[PDB]
Write a protein that binds this ligand. Structure first.
Ligand SMILES: C[N+]1(C)CCC[C@H]1C(=O)O
Length: 269
Protein backbone atom coordinates (compact mmCIF):
# COMPACT_ATOMS: atom_id res chain seq x y z
CA UNK A 1 0.00 0.00 0.00
CA UNK A 2 1.25 3.50 -0.81
CA UNK A 3 -0.16 4.73 2.51
CA UNK A 4 1.33 1.95 4.64
CA UNK A 5 4.62 2.21 2.73
CA UNK A 6 4.86 5.95 3.47
CA UNK A 7 4.10 5.29 7.14
CA UNK A 8 6.83 2.63 7.14
CA UNK A 9 9.36 5.00 5.55
CA UNK A 10 8.65 8.03 7.76
CA UNK A 11 8.79 5.88 10.89
CA UNK A 12 12.04 4.32 9.64
CA UNK A 13 13.57 7.76 9.02
CA UNK A 14 12.69 8.84 12.56
CA UNK A 15 13.78 5.54 14.13
CA UNK A 16 17.11 5.96 12.32
CA UNK A 17 17.38 9.36 14.03
CA UNK A 18 16.43 7.92 17.45
CA UNK A 19 18.82 4.98 17.14
CA UNK A 20 21.90 7.07 16.42
CA UNK A 21 21.14 9.23 19.45
CA UNK A 22 20.70 6.24 21.78
CA UNK A 23 23.65 4.41 20.20
CA UNK A 24 25.82 7.51 20.54
CA UNK A 25 24.90 8.09 24.17
CA UNK A 26 25.51 4.38 24.88
CA UNK A 27 28.84 4.26 23.03
CA UNK A 28 30.03 7.36 24.88
CA UNK A 29 29.20 5.84 28.28
CA UNK A 30 30.73 2.51 27.23
CA UNK A 31 33.93 4.43 26.45
CA UNK A 32 33.82 6.16 29.84
CA UNK A 33 33.31 2.79 31.52
CA UNK A 34 36.20 1.18 29.61
CA UNK A 35 38.47 4.13 30.46
CA UNK A 36 37.53 3.82 34.14
CA UNK A 37 38.18 0.07 34.07
CA UNK A 38 41.65 0.98 32.80
CA UNK A 39 42.59 3.59 35.40
CA UNK A 40 41.32 1.27 38.13
CA UNK A 41 43.41 -1.55 36.63
CA UNK A 42 46.60 0.39 35.93
CA UNK A 43 46.17 2.12 39.30
CA UNK A 44 46.24 -1.37 40.80
CA UNK A 45 49.15 -2.66 38.71
CA UNK A 46 51.45 0.13 39.85
CA UNK A 47 50.04 0.79 43.33
CA UNK A 48 49.15 4.29 42.15
CA UNK A 49 45.79 4.23 43.95
CA UNK A 50 44.88 2.73 47.31
CA UNK A 51 41.40 1.42 48.04
CA UNK A 52 40.36 4.84 49.36
CA UNK A 53 41.37 6.61 46.15
CA UNK A 54 39.66 4.05 43.93
CA UNK A 55 36.42 5.38 45.44
CA UNK A 56 37.50 8.99 44.82
CA UNK A 57 38.28 8.28 41.16
CA UNK A 58 35.08 6.28 40.59
CA UNK A 59 32.99 9.43 41.11
CA UNK A 60 34.50 11.10 38.03
CA UNK A 61 32.26 9.11 35.68
CA UNK A 62 29.10 10.70 37.13
CA UNK A 63 30.46 14.25 37.30
CA UNK A 64 31.40 14.20 33.60
CA UNK A 65 28.48 12.30 32.00
CA UNK A 66 24.97 13.38 32.98
CA UNK A 67 23.44 10.40 31.18
CA UNK A 68 25.03 7.96 33.66
CA UNK A 69 22.87 7.17 36.69
CA UNK A 70 25.69 5.53 38.63
CA UNK A 71 29.27 4.29 38.56
CA UNK A 72 30.37 1.16 40.39
CA UNK A 73 33.06 -1.49 40.78
CA UNK A 74 32.66 -5.08 41.97
CA UNK A 75 36.01 -6.57 42.97
CA UNK A 76 36.95 -10.23 42.60
CA UNK A 77 37.09 -11.63 46.17
CA UNK A 78 40.03 -10.10 48.13
CA UNK A 79 41.59 -8.97 44.84
CA UNK A 80 42.02 -5.20 45.33
CA UNK A 81 43.98 -4.87 48.58
CA UNK A 82 43.04 -7.84 50.79
CA UNK A 83 42.24 -5.64 53.80
CA UNK A 84 39.39 -6.45 56.18
CA UNK A 85 36.25 -4.87 54.82
CA UNK A 86 33.20 -5.80 56.90
CA UNK A 87 30.54 -3.06 56.69
CA UNK A 88 32.23 0.30 56.05
CA UNK A 89 30.24 2.03 53.32
CA UNK A 90 32.70 4.95 53.28
CA UNK A 91 35.41 2.39 52.35
CA UNK A 92 33.37 0.25 49.93
CA UNK A 93 32.50 -2.60 52.30
CA UNK A 94 29.24 -4.53 52.03
CA UNK A 95 27.73 -6.83 54.65
CA UNK A 96 29.30 -9.77 52.79
CA UNK A 97 32.78 -8.30 53.26
CA UNK A 98 33.74 -7.33 49.71
CA UNK A 99 35.03 -4.16 48.05
CA UNK A 100 31.88 -2.81 46.36
CA UNK A 101 31.84 0.98 45.96
CA UNK A 102 28.86 2.55 44.25
CA UNK A 103 28.19 6.18 43.35
CA UNK A 104 24.55 6.73 42.40
CA UNK A 105 21.86 9.38 42.32
CA UNK A 106 19.28 9.69 45.08
CA UNK A 107 15.67 10.91 45.01
CA UNK A 108 16.71 14.59 44.90
CA UNK A 109 19.28 14.33 42.10
CA UNK A 110 22.42 14.30 44.27
CA UNK A 111 25.28 11.78 44.44
CA UNK A 112 25.65 9.28 47.27
CA UNK A 113 28.06 6.48 48.11
CA UNK A 114 26.20 3.17 48.27
CA UNK A 115 27.27 -0.48 48.44
CA UNK A 116 25.91 -3.67 46.92
CA UNK A 117 26.18 -7.44 47.11
CA UNK A 118 28.81 -9.28 45.05
CA UNK A 119 26.46 -11.41 42.93
CA UNK A 120 29.06 -12.88 40.57
CA UNK A 121 26.44 -14.87 38.65
CA UNK A 122 24.40 -11.70 38.04
CA UNK A 123 24.32 -10.41 34.49
CA UNK A 124 26.12 -7.16 35.34
CA UNK A 125 29.14 -9.14 36.56
CA UNK A 126 28.95 -12.46 34.72
CA UNK A 127 28.56 -11.18 31.16
CA UNK A 128 31.68 -9.00 31.14
CA UNK A 129 33.71 -11.51 33.17
CA UNK A 130 32.86 -14.53 31.00
CA UNK A 131 33.49 -12.78 27.66
CA UNK A 132 36.47 -10.66 28.74
CA UNK A 133 34.86 -7.89 26.69
CA UNK A 134 32.57 -5.01 27.59
CA UNK A 135 28.90 -5.94 27.92
CA UNK A 136 25.45 -4.51 28.63
CA UNK A 137 22.73 -6.06 30.79
CA UNK A 138 19.08 -6.81 30.36
CA UNK A 139 17.01 -4.31 32.35
CA UNK A 140 17.08 -5.15 36.04
CA UNK A 141 16.07 -3.58 39.33
CA UNK A 142 19.18 -2.19 41.05
CA UNK A 143 19.87 -2.98 44.74
CA UNK A 144 22.35 -0.40 46.00
CA UNK A 145 20.42 2.62 44.74
CA UNK A 146 18.89 5.02 47.27
CA UNK A 147 15.42 4.41 45.91
CA UNK A 148 14.67 1.25 43.90
CA UNK A 149 15.26 2.08 40.25
CA UNK A 150 15.21 0.03 37.05
CA UNK A 151 18.40 0.40 35.02
CA UNK A 152 20.67 -1.21 32.45
CA UNK A 153 24.39 -1.55 33.16
CA UNK A 154 27.44 -1.25 30.91
CA UNK A 155 30.25 -3.24 32.53
CA UNK A 156 33.89 -3.86 31.63
CA UNK A 157 36.52 -6.19 33.07
CA UNK A 158 39.12 -4.51 35.27
CA UNK A 159 42.59 -5.94 34.60
CA UNK A 160 45.76 -5.71 36.72
CA UNK A 161 48.88 -7.17 35.06
CA UNK A 162 47.06 -9.61 32.80
CA UNK A 163 44.82 -11.09 35.54
CA UNK A 164 41.33 -9.69 36.07
CA UNK A 165 40.55 -8.39 39.56
CA UNK A 166 36.91 -7.36 39.20
CA UNK A 167 34.30 -5.58 37.11
CA UNK A 168 33.56 -1.87 36.74
CA UNK A 169 30.51 -0.43 35.03
CA UNK A 170 28.12 2.47 34.49
CA UNK A 171 24.31 2.64 34.75
CA UNK A 172 21.53 4.02 32.56
CA UNK A 173 18.25 4.40 34.41
CA UNK A 174 15.21 3.28 32.48
CA UNK A 175 13.84 6.77 33.22
CA UNK A 176 16.82 8.49 31.59
CA UNK A 177 16.10 6.50 28.42
CA UNK A 178 12.41 7.47 28.54
CA UNK A 179 13.54 11.10 28.92
CA UNK A 180 15.75 11.00 25.82
CA UNK A 181 12.89 9.53 23.79
CA UNK A 182 10.98 12.71 24.62
CA UNK A 183 13.91 15.08 24.25
CA UNK A 184 14.13 13.99 20.63
CA UNK A 185 10.50 14.07 19.83
CA UNK A 186 7.78 11.59 19.01
CA UNK A 187 5.72 11.46 15.79
CA UNK A 188 3.21 14.09 16.90
CA UNK A 189 0.47 11.97 18.12
CA UNK A 190 3.12 9.37 17.72
CA UNK A 191 4.87 7.54 20.47
CA UNK A 192 8.31 5.95 20.41
CA UNK A 193 9.34 3.10 22.70
CA UNK A 194 12.40 0.88 23.07
CA UNK A 195 13.01 -2.87 23.44
CA UNK A 196 16.11 -4.60 24.78
CA UNK A 197 18.40 -7.26 23.31
CA UNK A 198 15.76 -9.93 24.03
CA UNK A 199 12.65 -7.82 23.47
CA UNK A 200 12.18 -6.72 27.07
CA UNK A 201 10.58 -3.28 27.57
CA UNK A 202 13.18 -0.52 28.15
CA UNK A 203 10.76 2.34 27.47
CA UNK A 204 7.07 1.45 27.48
CA UNK A 205 3.60 3.03 27.45
CA UNK A 206 2.83 2.18 31.08
CA UNK A 207 5.63 1.56 33.62
CA UNK A 208 4.22 -1.87 34.53
CA UNK A 209 5.57 -3.17 31.18
CA UNK A 210 9.21 -2.32 31.88
CA UNK A 211 11.66 -5.22 32.10
CA UNK A 212 8.96 -7.59 30.85
CA UNK A 213 9.21 -9.37 27.50
CA UNK A 214 7.18 -8.11 24.57
CA UNK A 215 4.12 -10.24 23.94
CA UNK A 216 1.68 -7.70 22.48
CA UNK A 217 0.37 -7.78 18.94
CA UNK A 218 2.97 -8.55 16.31
CA UNK A 219 5.20 -10.47 18.73
CA UNK A 220 6.63 -12.82 16.09
CA UNK A 221 7.74 -9.92 13.90
CA UNK A 222 9.64 -8.53 16.90
CA UNK A 223 11.41 -11.88 17.24
CA UNK A 224 12.08 -11.90 13.48
CA UNK A 225 13.26 -8.28 13.41
CA UNK A 226 15.58 -9.21 16.29
CA UNK A 227 17.03 -12.04 14.17
CA UNK A 228 17.41 -10.44 10.74
CA UNK A 229 18.39 -7.10 12.28
CA UNK A 230 16.17 -5.49 9.68
CA UNK A 231 13.02 -3.43 10.30
CA UNK A 232 9.54 -4.88 10.56
CA UNK A 233 6.09 -3.27 10.69
CA UNK A 234 3.18 -4.59 12.74
CA UNK A 235 0.04 -3.49 10.92
CA UNK A 236 -3.11 -2.45 12.62
CA UNK A 237 -2.94 -3.03 16.30
CA UNK A 238 -5.24 -1.48 18.85
CA UNK A 239 -5.00 -0.08 22.29
CA UNK A 240 -8.58 -0.74 22.09
CA UNK A 241 -11.06 1.01 19.93
CA UNK A 242 -9.78 4.43 20.45
CA UNK A 243 -7.26 5.00 17.67
CA UNK A 244 -5.51 2.20 15.94
CA UNK A 245 -2.03 2.47 14.71
CA UNK A 246 0.96 0.80 13.26
CA UNK A 247 4.00 -0.44 15.18
CA UNK A 248 7.34 -0.17 13.37
CA UNK A 249 10.26 -2.02 14.95
CA UNK A 250 13.80 -0.84 14.19
CA UNK A 251 16.78 -2.86 15.44
CA UNK A 252 20.08 -1.04 15.82
CA UNK A 253 23.47 -2.19 17.10
CA UNK A 254 24.86 -0.60 20.15
CA UNK A 255 28.41 0.29 19.78
CA UNK A 256 30.77 -1.55 22.01
CA UNK A 257 28.83 -3.83 24.21
CA UNK A 258 27.87 -6.42 21.75
CA UNK A 259 24.10 -6.04 21.62
CA UNK A 260 21.27 -4.42 19.70
CA UNK A 261 18.05 -2.69 20.72
CA UNK A 262 14.68 -2.12 19.06
CA UNK A 263 13.21 1.29 18.53
CA UNK A 264 9.43 1.04 18.37
CA UNK A 265 7.67 3.90 16.63
CA UNK A 266 3.89 4.01 16.89
CA UNK A 267 2.03 5.92 14.18
CA UNK A 268 -1.77 6.32 14.47
CA UNK A 269 -4.10 6.03 11.49
C1 LIG B 1 25.48 -1.51 42.03
N1 LIG B 1 24.75 -1.80 40.77
C2 LIG B 1 24.10 -0.59 40.24
C3 LIG B 1 25.58 -2.30 39.89
C4 LIG B 1 25.69 -3.89 40.26
C5 LIG B 1 24.71 -4.19 40.99
C6 LIG B 1 23.75 -2.93 40.92
C7 LIG B 1 22.87 -2.87 42.07
O1 LIG B 1 22.27 -3.92 42.44
O2 LIG B 1 22.68 -1.79 42.68
Amino acid sequence: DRVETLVFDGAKTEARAIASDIAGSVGELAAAARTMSGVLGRGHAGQSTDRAGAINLLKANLEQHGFAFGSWFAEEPKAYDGKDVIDNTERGGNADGAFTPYWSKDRNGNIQLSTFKADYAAEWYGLAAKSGKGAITQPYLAEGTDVPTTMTSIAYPVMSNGRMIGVSGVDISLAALADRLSAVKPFGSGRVYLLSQSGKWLAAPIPELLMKEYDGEGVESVKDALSTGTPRMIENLTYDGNEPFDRVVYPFSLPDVNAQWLVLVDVPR
